[PDB]
Design a binder for this molecule. Sequence first.
Ligand SMILES: NC(=O)c1ccc[n+]([C@@H]2O[C@H](COP(=O)([O-])OP(=O)(O)OC[C@H]3O[C@@H](n4cnc5c(N)ncnc54)[C@H](O)[C@@H]3O)[C@@H](O)[C@H]2O)c1
Ligand SMILES: NC(=O)c1ccc[n+]([C@@H]2O[C@H](COP(=O)([O-])OP(=O)(O)OC[C@H]3O[C@@H](n4cnc5c(N)ncnc54)[C@H](O)[C@@H]3O)[C@@H](O)[C@H]2O)c1
Ligand SMILES: NC(=O)c1ccc[n+]([C@@H]2O[C@H](COP(=O)([O-])OP(=O)(O)OC[C@H]3O[C@@H](n4cnc5c(N)ncnc54)[C@H](O)[C@@H]3O)[C@@H](O)[C@H]2O)c1
Ligand SMILES: NC(=O)c1ccc[n+]([C@@H]2O[C@H](COP(=O)([O-])OP(=O)(O)OC[C@H]3O[C@@H](n4cnc5c(N)ncnc54)[C@H](O)[C@@H]3O)[C@@H](O)[C@H]2O)c1
Lengths: 371, 367, 366, 366
Amino acid sequence: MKIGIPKEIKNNENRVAITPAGVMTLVKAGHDVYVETEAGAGSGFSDSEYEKAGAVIVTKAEDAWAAEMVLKVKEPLAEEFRYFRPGLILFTYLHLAAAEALTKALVEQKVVGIAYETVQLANGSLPLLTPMSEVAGRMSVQVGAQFLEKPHGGKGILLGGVPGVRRGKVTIIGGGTAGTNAAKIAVGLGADVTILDINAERLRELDDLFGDQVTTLMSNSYHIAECVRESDLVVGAVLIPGAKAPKLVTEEMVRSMTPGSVLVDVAIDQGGIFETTDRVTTHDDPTYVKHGVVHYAVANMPGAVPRTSTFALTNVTIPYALQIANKGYRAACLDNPALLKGINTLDGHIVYEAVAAAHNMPYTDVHSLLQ
Amino acid sequence: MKIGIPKEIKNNENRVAITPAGVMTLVKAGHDVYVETEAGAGSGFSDSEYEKAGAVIVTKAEDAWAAEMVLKVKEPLAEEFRYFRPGLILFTYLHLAAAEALTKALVEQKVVGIAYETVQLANGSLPLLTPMSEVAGRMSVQVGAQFLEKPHGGKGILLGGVPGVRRGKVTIIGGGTAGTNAAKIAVGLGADVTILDINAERLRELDDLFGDQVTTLMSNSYHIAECVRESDLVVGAVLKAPKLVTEEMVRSMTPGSVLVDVAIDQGGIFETTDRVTTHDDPTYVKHGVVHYAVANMPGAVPRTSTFALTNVTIPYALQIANKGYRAACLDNPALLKGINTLDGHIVYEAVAAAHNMPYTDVHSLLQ
Amino acid sequence: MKIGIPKEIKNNENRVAITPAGVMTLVKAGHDVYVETEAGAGSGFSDSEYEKAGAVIVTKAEDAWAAEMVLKVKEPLAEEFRYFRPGLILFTYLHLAAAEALTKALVEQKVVGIAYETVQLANGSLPLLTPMSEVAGRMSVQVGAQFLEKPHGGKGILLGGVPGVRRGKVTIIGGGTAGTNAAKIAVGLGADVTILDINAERLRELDDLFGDQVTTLMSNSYHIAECVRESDLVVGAVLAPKLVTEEMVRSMTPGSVLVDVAIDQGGIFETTDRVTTHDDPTYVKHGVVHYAVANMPGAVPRTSTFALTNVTIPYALQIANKGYRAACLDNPALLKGINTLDGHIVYEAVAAAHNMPYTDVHSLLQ
Amino acid sequence: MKIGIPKEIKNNENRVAITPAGVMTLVKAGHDVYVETEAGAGSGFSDSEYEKAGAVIVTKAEDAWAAEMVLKVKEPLAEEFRYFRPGLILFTYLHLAAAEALTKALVEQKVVGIAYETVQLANGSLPLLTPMSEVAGRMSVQVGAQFLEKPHGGKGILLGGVPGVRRGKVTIIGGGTAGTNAAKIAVGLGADVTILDINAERLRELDDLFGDQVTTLMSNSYHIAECVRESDLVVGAVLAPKLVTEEMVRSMTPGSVLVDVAIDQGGIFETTDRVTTHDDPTYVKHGVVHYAVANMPGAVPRTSTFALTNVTIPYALQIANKGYRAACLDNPALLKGINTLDGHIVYEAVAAAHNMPYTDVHSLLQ
Ligand SMILES: NC(=O)c1ccc[n+]([C@@H]2O[C@H](COP(=O)([O-])OP(=O)(O)OC[C@H]3O[C@@H](n4cnc5c(N)ncnc54)[C@H](O)[C@@H]3O)[C@@H](O)[C@H]2O)c1
Ligand SMILES: NC(=O)c1ccc[n+]([C@@H]2O[C@H](COP(=O)([O-])OP(=O)(O)OC[C@H]3O[C@@H](n4cnc5c(N)ncnc54)[C@H](O)[C@@H]3O)[C@@H](O)[C@H]2O)c1
Ligand SMILES: NC(=O)c1ccc[n+]([C@@H]2O[C@H](COP(=O)([O-])OP(=O)(O)OC[C@H]3O[C@@H](n4cnc5c(N)ncnc54)[C@H](O)[C@@H]3O)[C@@H](O)[C@H]2O)c1
Ligand SMILES: NC(=O)c1ccc[n+]([C@@H]2O[C@H](COP(=O)([O-])OP(=O)(O)OC[C@H]3O[C@@H](n4cnc5c(N)ncnc54)[C@H](O)[C@@H]3O)[C@@H](O)[C@H]2O)c1
């Protein structure tokens, strides 16, 4: 197959959908790989690294979009709908559910739209989201430590203190992928770390992973209120895999906090777990203050570490791209029930039930269209 | 003794030379303690907490300086020379060898000028500087990781990577207090960490402290070049520091790599650091490499730094209060090395030599 | 039941199919246990330790094979065919797909041939192969360290260096049983350790298990090329594709070392054209030391004997308590051990391999 | 100053007295550095890496020895005496108490003979011996592990066992540099580790350094007897009394292994009557494998070269910058390195050993 990778145009998106490594994998299995000039530059991948891995650097966005399969990171924007052909394979984060101009255009132009965030294994996990939760978790406590400094608005402490000086107190609410990764960094910076979860089995796994390095605590509104009161930093790391994030930290809890404490709501991309998070912050404008407490709620924390973020995402997308390339999108999706759950749009139909259901649009079961 | 702690007035100085706990130590020993209103605000110590520990809050700087002994963090500014007077005991970071005007004013007003940073134990250690090298070391890698992010001008990596993704490389040049404390934080963030030192015995001690968590490496120009070339972050942690990292080495680094120097207000080890920045505008780029050039990293964590400093300064201050400066220094040879100015003389050789001013033997004045 | 353990007679085979602790389990459950004199000597178990645990020591191999069930480690050699007889239960590593003459002798003599290596749990795992994978993994890096010494042909480094001196770099390809166990020894000897696996979930589990002691890296030909170029030691622990090409070995520094856990199974190195023995253990290609000695668990026969017999004797106990038929109908994993029964090959792959008739084992056991 | 590094010519000596990094230090301080072609090949340093660091490669040993200061690892052999000349500075391991012919040649030719091994800090430590003690310690347990494998004569265990299988037991006698470094490798290979020392303060420091990873035990003939009887591996790391008697070795299980870091210095084992080489490395007494190969750092020449040159070249730099006289009057540790000067033996022990006149070094340097 002819495989195309255009540069990300969405503002300050420094991630790309392939590395020299993933180029070399597709080239060696017999595919043609075209990379838009400068696509890797945001992540430190020069055009000459991509070239020596076997890829053709094309001058123009349309020459990458030309290819049978387009690999991207972000949603195609207004300006990119144009490039949609019939039987174009598009593989990227789509979140069609609240993107109606995108969904009509992939319906109308008969693009095969394959979504990173709906590829799903039999145990129900989303392998293609996990890496971004890992990056966001590791970032959460690094960001927390920065905001604890007096210059950024915090009370002016190191999480680890120093000899003869008390350590900062970190509460992580949610003990899954994001929270576990956040706890690793909070332990490593020398914080006194409490992790809360509702799942007693996850608490036992965290106790096996961390031992005496953390305290595991059963999550309930009382325990959350007690931890928040005494916290220098609270990391929000809850997912209810369908829903909006539950509001676990109340205004009354935030008001119980000491001035210059910090909240980082990893869970903001689902609405966030803090009642007091009234809006989404940006890397440019990361924080506001309410009740003397610094609030950080950046979506795309992993956007801050695009080189790490790109490796982690393409480590697990390119193996699914190789299947589509090697066997055509059809044989590969019949062969791989997890890839199949990726098809969001096919031959003008909206084959994913929840996206048709949220745009008031027709839903055609995907299996009937494939046989 | 009547003891005074004014607010630090230097720009964005948020540390303070006493905490409520130190107030309690001095009040219980029978001393009167006067704290200037808001002196602890920048470190999160309220007037009310100081008052509850036994302090009198005074409204005016002048009323804290009126005390027999004044404790501070920074050197008095020109606008504070007015408070100097014969027999005033001043105990603070003075750095008199760099400050001709302050030296002359302490001499002219016959101030007992005691420098935190020249208090020196029999083994050569400077115990009132150590806590600030510890904070600076812990901060160096936190700041370096922050500048590694794409938004702050770096190449955009986590030092610890994530599963399936390689870690960042950290080179720490210097395995003393600052460097050891930097290595702790670099290990904790998940970096591949190399520590260079010239002293074989310190590398053996570091091997005992860290084992497999780091690689210890003998310092020479070749090994420094080799580590710098492949580093994402380099931390300068050597005690006027030699220029160990050359322009050629910085130019060998990948773009969006980061350099941080603990020693930057003493020149630092990097040829390419032409100036000191502030928290407002903290970095510049040379050869695509981020140069974090903020001096006084401990000042970014004033509460931790205030606890770290006052943990070791207040016991000395307590000796001066109980016994008077004279018996305290005659009883404590480490505290005696703290005396820089006394009764209109410079008694610290290096300060006399720095300004070509007369030197006086400290023991001869104390008798 | 009467249970016999002959001495292993393959050249330099020093493992044994039971220890005194396994004798004790079988004798306390009421079985008669016969051990050939010297059977355990190669693994440091005296005739006397077997006797005190309740075994009868027999002077001749014949008398151990005359038992109703024979426990062994390796496959019977040609000169052991003479001991086969209708209704003999033989429980050992058989590898019949590779052994036509052995397969035909088990058919003709109507032996119940139970293969350690086809006993298989519901989850697909081979619990009687696992312990040799663990031992080979642990051994792989110990051998690598040895071959990095100059007098053995290596560049002459310690993996952990010394204070002021850089560490060796160890790349482990495959994060399963063997590769995880290799990583434990690489970490403990003080190497800089990278483990590659194609499976993102395994990389996460490895991160949970090792944290900062190793780097986990997604496997692909590019990551492999980059790791191999920098490596002092590469351990192949994949289960067998040629992941490490000749160009990759050529990129290496002279006196680097390659070890495959997978050697008699082909291995992952294009440049390992043949297998060697302990008296001429390595060859050099492009200045790189290729360690090619099969069966590294054979070099620690006492450890390997304990690790194998720990998990074999519970299955033997079932056969002895119930007889093979009810043991197999009660234990689906043990049922999959049966390769030959009443003159039939009951394991499809083995039948295929020799162009012989296959019979469904369930039909014969009824 | 002009500084020469000949190739070591003692049989199988693969270490070298400088690396490219040491060349670079000496050339940047303005010295001329001459390296004999192949000097570094045995430690993986090409003529080319030396040239890029600023050395001149010389075809003949003669041309390296013609330098004003000669850096070596080992003592000059008889056939190297011809290179000696009045005022030559030779900095190397000399061991003159053991080498009459070498001592007489250094006197007669008026060589400034500076011994790496008599450089001594104010605290009594020998900073240029320490790194070989570290390397030998790390090597001792790696060798022990190798000799516990059956094909090398051992009982056939892994030190760390495997899951469900007991670990090997390692006794380290002496908790100094070598014995501490041995303990690190014993712990990392997964051994049960006991370290004995007569010094209670060292046992506390060892407890601080290892905590629950080892047991610390006060040394006395009873504790030694009990540890040795149970040991799979005993590492002698004492600095040389016969702490391990023949009765103690006789109490051991067959295929156990003894390694002394101290072997060419006598060692602590009554039963090690002689030293061996890598081609016949062990002998067996009372079924116990005695490893008797001298100079284990010689087996990792690259690691050992880095570890030695890390601490030797700073002293060489001083000699080259100031000349030997002012370097020694400025550096009391380096002063103690001087063994021969202007036709005098200036190190009492060496004079004593050969019944020769002693001269006070301070009197000659004035
Ligand atoms: N752009 C970004 O910044 C970015 C990118 C990707 C993912 N993430 C986010 O990381 C956040 C967490 O996701 P994850 O992958 O760790 O989810 P996860 O499913 O792996 O773990 C979430 C945990 O929350 C626990 N939980 C549920 N209700 C709880 C309660 N009341 N109290 C405490 N714990 C509770 C669950 O038991 C589970 O262990 C999500 O919002 C996810 O979107 C953010
Ligand atoms: N606010 C602050 O940042 C702050 C406060 C106090 C002191 N300091 C500064 O911290 C710096 C260093 O602090 P420390 O506590 O680590 O010092 P330290 O005195 O404990 O030791 C410095 C280490 O560097 C090593 N060293 C010397 N030369 C070297 C070389 N050429 N290559 C490699 N290693 C070499 C020494 O052997 C030593 O182990 C000093 O420059 C001092 O001025 C900073
Ligand atoms: N005599 C003996 O030495 C002996 C005895 C028994 C087993 N073994 C050997 O053990 C070896 C494997 O042992 P195991 O139990 O650890 O295997 P395993 O199946 O437990 O693990 C294999 C791992 O390799 C990974 N993998 C697959 N393809 C890969 C690629 N291209 N790159 C990187 N990783 C990849 C898998 O995801 C898996 O985690 C086999 O080769 C087998 O022959 C040897
Ligand atoms: N070529 C080489 O292999 C090489 C090179 C240099 C040094 N070395 C060797 O290293 C060996 C020792 O090295 P080190 O630097 O570790 O020594 P060290 O002096 O640092 O430590 C010796 C330790 O043994 C202890 N000790 C004394 N008597 C004891 C007894 N009866 N039982 C138990 N402990 C006792 C001491 O308290 C001390 O802690 C020497 O024997 C020396 O020959 C070898």
